[PDB]
Amino acid sequence: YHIDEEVGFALPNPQENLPDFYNDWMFIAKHLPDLIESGQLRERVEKLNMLSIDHLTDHKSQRLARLVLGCITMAYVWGKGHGDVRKVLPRNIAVPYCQLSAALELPPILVYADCVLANWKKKDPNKPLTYENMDVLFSFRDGDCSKGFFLVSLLVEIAAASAIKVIPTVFKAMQMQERDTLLKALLEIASCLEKALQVFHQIHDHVNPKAFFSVLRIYLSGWKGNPQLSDGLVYEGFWEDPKEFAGGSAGQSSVFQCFDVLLGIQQTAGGGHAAQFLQDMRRYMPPAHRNFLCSLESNPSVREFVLSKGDAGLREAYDACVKALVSLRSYHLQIVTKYILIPASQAKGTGGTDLMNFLKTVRSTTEKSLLK
Numbered sequence: 001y002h003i004d005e006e007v008g009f010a011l012p013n014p015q016e017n018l019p020d021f022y023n024d025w026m027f028i029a030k031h032l033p034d035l036i037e038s039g040q041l042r043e044r045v046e047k048l049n050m051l052s053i054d055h056l057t058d059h060k061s062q063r064l065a066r067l068v069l070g071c072i073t074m075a076y077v078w079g080k081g082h083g084d085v086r087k088v089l090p091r092n093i094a095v096p097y098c099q100l101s102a103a104l105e106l107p108p109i110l111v112y113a114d115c116v117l118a119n120w121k122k123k124d125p126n127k128p129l130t131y132e133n134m135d136v137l138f139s140f141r142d143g144d145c146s147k148g149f150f151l152v153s154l155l156v157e158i159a160a161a162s163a164i165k166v167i168p169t170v171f172k173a174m175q176m177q178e179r180d181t182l183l184k185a186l187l188e189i190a191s192c193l194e195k196a197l198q199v200f201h202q203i204h205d206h207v208n209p210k211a212f213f214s215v216l217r218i219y220l221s222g223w224k225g226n227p228q229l230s231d232g233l234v235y236e237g238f239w240e241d242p243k244e245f246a247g248g249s250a251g252q253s254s255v256f257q258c259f260d261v262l263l264g265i266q267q268t269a270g271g272g273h274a275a276q277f278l279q280d281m282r283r284y285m286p287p288a289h290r291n292f293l294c295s296l297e298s299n300p301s302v303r304e305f306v307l308s309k310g311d312a313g314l315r316e317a318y319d320a321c322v323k324a325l326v327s328l329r330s331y332h333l334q335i336v337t338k339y340i341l342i343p344a345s346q347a348k349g350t351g352g353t354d355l356m357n358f359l360k361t362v363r364s365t366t367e368k369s370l371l372k
């Protein structure tokens with residue numbers, strides 16, 4: 001399922017340099033701030049040779065190439081970020097990008113798995129995974145707080161990895177009827193989820209709201225229900241008609257969904273808009289991680305097991321997990337207020353109110369699953 005013990009859904013030790021064959025791509029991606037500002041970004045993209053993807057032969061080089069092409073694509077479409085957009089992606093980016101995206105089974109737009117899960121390095125390999133020892137590989141504009149937003153997102157993923165590695169213990173304990181082992185597992189998950197909540201606080205240290213809202217959000221925006229590209233984007237030379245794809249959001253994280261699925265909280269049940277969105281966002285996750293979520297829904301229910309045993313210790317450990325999720329969602333809502341709602345007050349579903357209502361629906365659905 002391509003889940004790492006240490007960093008979870010994050011790509012371990014991402015690749016940083018492509019083969020020299022792709023130098024022309026890497027130069028543009030590494031210089032987005034200068035090229036966007038000077039107005040050379042679009043000219044440089046339009047001057048690119050067509051580069052075959054046949055020199056990208058392992059998962060790490062393909063993932064780096066997707067991140068490179070994805071950042072180039074956002075810079076090309078959105079430009080300087082003030083409404084002068086391009087609705088046609090030139091063939092010499094669109095064709096290799098779409099081919100690579102098909103091989104990796106991801107849509108041809110920058111997604112969370114590119115610009116967070118694969119967009120990072122350790123400064124010192126001998127030091128731990130702390131903010132001070134980490135950097136991103138690509139940013140869009142000087143002052144866009146991309147390092148802070150991407151790395152804090154990644155730090156939440158790494159924190160969650162401590163809980164994700166316990167999930168097999170949970171199902172093995174239910175299968176083997178190991179009550180004490182299951183109780184310890186559920187409590188360990190809840191403890192890790194509250195430590196993940198502590199990581200959330202780091203966003204205030206590294207991301208300021210004006211920069212995030214007015215700059216970074218622009219470059220992460222997509223072309224699904226977006227009035228600036230109402231029919232989607234033309235991937236020139238690959239598909240004739242434009243296609244719509246959503247921009248990035250926290251709902252693309254597998255961490256956002258996997259614990260609800262583990263605990264039997266049915267966030268994708270029904271035809272409601274929140275459910276449909278979370279189902280649709282699975283298409284924006286790496287296929288192995290989609291598969292992991294699907295396997296969790298097919299396993300015997302943790303929730304029915306705990307409810308069937310007349311075990312107040314099991315129910316409370318389960319409830320500790322649920323409350324931890326509820327806290328996480330509530331802090332998530334505070335982030336929406338500080339980083340979106342308030343900056344806005346001075347694309348369909350992108351509106352801060354729609355984002356707010358979505359998280360409130362999710363948090364309510366989580367609260368409903370409390371046993372007592």
Ligand SMILES: Cc1ccc(NC(=O)Nc2cc([C@H]3C[C@H]3C(=O)O)ccc2N(CC(C)C)C2CCCCC2)cc1
Pocket residue numbers: 110111112115116149150152153154156157199200201203220247248249250251252253255256332335336339340355
């Ligand atoms: C392409 C792309 C897509 C997404 C992202 N990373 C992002 O969105 N992180 C995020 C955003 C919001 C706010 C805007 C509203 C939302 O999108 O729901 C709240 C919380 C978070 N996390 C932890 C934070 C403390 C940084 C998320 C919360 C769920 C688990 C992962 C981290 C980066 C690039």
